[PDB]
Structures are given as structure tokens and as C-alpha cells.
Amino acid sequence: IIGGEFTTIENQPWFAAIYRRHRGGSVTYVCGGSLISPCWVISATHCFIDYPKKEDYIVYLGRSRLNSNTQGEMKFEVENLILHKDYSADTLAYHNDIALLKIRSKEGRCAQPSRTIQTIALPSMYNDPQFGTSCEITGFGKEQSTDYLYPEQLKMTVVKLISHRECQQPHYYGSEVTTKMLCAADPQWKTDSCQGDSGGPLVCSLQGRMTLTGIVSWGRGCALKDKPGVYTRVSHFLPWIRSHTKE
């Protein structure tokens, strides 16, 4: 996250931290995700495509720091890794960039909710907020594009939704933005998602509910003029989600 502010898991308790194990034993951060039910985490397919073996992943919930444990955190193995069948990647962007992870502990249990571990509500089909609405993004992604390292402390910021019309202009992304994507940005372009925020939540309060509106997917640079962040439009994928979550 470029700009914004440091936060803790209590402010975003559905945030899932996803890591990949290596052979000689080292564990490294992969992507963000969002807890949508005790046994299920939603993220982005591009996080996993290159290594799509479930045994390779660990999920943490209740975790505020990247490479240090947070008191109360829970570790999970990935029982099932579900990648979207129509996923693709261009020279530029990803399509159908959505994934589901069924989590279970070594004890055979799903997530136990707490002050640091909560689920987030899904949206209503084909219902997204108005353009110009302010929403939250969260993650452990870079604080500046030039950084080599990732913050050890979780961060969050605010960006405003951009009209499909506006984001589709060549000044911006032209035809690369489809209707299954949502754009959002800072009006000064001063704050944004960046590398390592992928798979994480875009959260808006539509009506009275905090709701998972988008999943961090792509963009050109970070906090770059006329180049907004692009998010998997979750309200267009509800049949896919409910289908693969009924087990």
C-alpha cells in the first residue's frame, strides 16, 4: 500500500495472509485474501497459477505482521485450491482473476472467529457502489514502487471508485478494462495498492454493511497518474463463488 496508514488486524479481521513453502524449508509471502466463511478464503488466481499445488500454501488469519507472529493468530493448510477456469493473462492484465482456498488446520478445524479473526460479507449480485464512493484497501504490499522490501506491519488506505466509462478511456486503460473489473484510485493519485497487495480486499460499505466489493488484481505502476488500481468485480462472480463453496 502506497501512502495510507499502518493498521492492525482488528481493523480488517477478515484479512488473510497467504504464504508459500519452499523445499529447503523457507516460507515466503505470496498474496492477500479475504475470509468469507470459516473454511473459505477468496483471493486472486494469478497468485497461484505458477505453482498451483495446494500443499504448497499456508494461510494465516489474525496476523498483523508479515514475518513475525501476532498473538492469537491461526495457521492453516490449504485443503483445496480452486482457480477460475476462464483465467487469462495478457501482455497487460489478468481476466477472471479470482480464487478460492478451503482452509483446515493440522487439527482439522476451520477458522475460529475472535477479535482478530472475522468473516466479511459478500455483495449482492450486480450491485456495486456509485462512482466516486470511497472504499478501503489493505495489505502488506510495497510502500513505494522502488522499494525492494515489504512492510512488516499491515497497512490500509482509501481509494475512490472510478466509472467504467472513465477507466476505459485510452488516457487510462482503454479496452483492457472489462465489465468484470472495477477501477479505483486517489483523486491526487497519491495513495494506492502496489506489488504484494494482490488478492487482498477492496471493502466498501454499501448500505449499512462492510462488503467485499473487489479483489486487488492489477495496474500500471503504483499511485501513478491516470493509471488506477484494477480490482476483480466480486458482484459479477457470485454464481461461481456459491457454486464452488457448496461442497
Binding site: 498474496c31 494469478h46 495478457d90 497487495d197 494482490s198 492489477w218
Partner: peptide, 10 residues
């Protein structure tokens, strides 16, 4: 890796 990837391994 697409040019506009944000993925931590691109």
C-alpha cells in the same frame, strides 16, 4: 508476467 502485474513474484 503481464506488464501491469502487481504479484509479488513479478
Amino acid at each position: 508476467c503481464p506488464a501491469y502485474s502487481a504479484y509479488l513474484d513479478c
